[PDB]
Ligand binder design. Structure first.
Ligand SMILES: Nc1nc2c(ncn2[C@@H]2O[C@H](COP(=O)(O)OP(=O)(O)NP(=O)(O)O)[C@@H](O)[C@H]2O)c(=O)[nH]1
Ligand SMILES: [Ca+2]
Ligand SMILES: [Mg+2]
Ligand SMILES: [Mg+2]
Length: 166
């Protein structure tokens, strides 16, 4: 069966681990334990196809930025997460996407831009601002809540479907 190497990237605290754990383990992690680098694998059916999702949950803390080159080298698709209540994380995710492009020396890296924490009402990134950023990359924008599960499957499965357009 096809294996898909997904990598979840973004600034600290935007909910990378919460999104991944919700997808793989179907529960919401309320506490905040900063990640170094964790890996998850799960067999799922997507569009009638049995596949293996290999998911790398990466560090948002800048203290571990040295590890980025290795995982950007090997990742096949990138879930580029920011939190809609964190304008700085939106500015940061643009930097992540440029770094991925640079490390991979490619203009066509499979990516999905994800605006997480859409259950919160303290929004400072409007959907249209994120839509514009995605459009300049030619990639989808999807809003999610790891807390309510809204959009979580859509976001990860869209990224699978992006890898398959390539
Ligand atoms: N309300 C709400 N809180 C969320 C959501 N996603 C994550 N959180 C909360 O935000 C905090 C950080 O989540 P976490 O997944 O650890 O973020 P992270 O991006 O993995 N952090 P790091 O980069 O340091 O590993 C946690 O308290 C978590 O419960 C969401 O969609 N909604
Ligand atoms: Ca803890
Ligand atoms: Mg984490
Ligand atoms: Mg504004």
């Amino acid at each position: 069966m096809t294996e898909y190497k997904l990598v979840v990237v973004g600034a600290g605290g935007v909910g990378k681990s919460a999104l991944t754990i919700q997808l793989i383990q179907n529960h919401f992690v309320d506490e905040y334990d900063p990640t170094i680098e964790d890996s998850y694998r799960k067999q799922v059916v997507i569009d009638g196809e049995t596949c293996l999702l290999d998911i790398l949950d990466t560090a948002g803390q800048e203290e571990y930025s040295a590890m980025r080159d290795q995982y950007m080298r090997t990742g096949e698709g990138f879930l580029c997460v920011f939190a809609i209540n964190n304008t700085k994380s939106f500015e940061d995710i643009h930097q992540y996407m440029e770094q991925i492009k640079r490390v991979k020396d490619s203009d066509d890296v499979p990516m999905v831009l994800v605006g997480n924490k859409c259950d919160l009402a303290a929004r400072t990134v409007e959907s249209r601002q994120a839509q514009d950023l995605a459009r300049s990359y030619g990639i989808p924008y999807i809003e999610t809540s790891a807390k309510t599960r809204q959009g979580v499957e859509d976001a990860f499965y869209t990224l699978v479907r992006e890898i398959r357009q390539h």
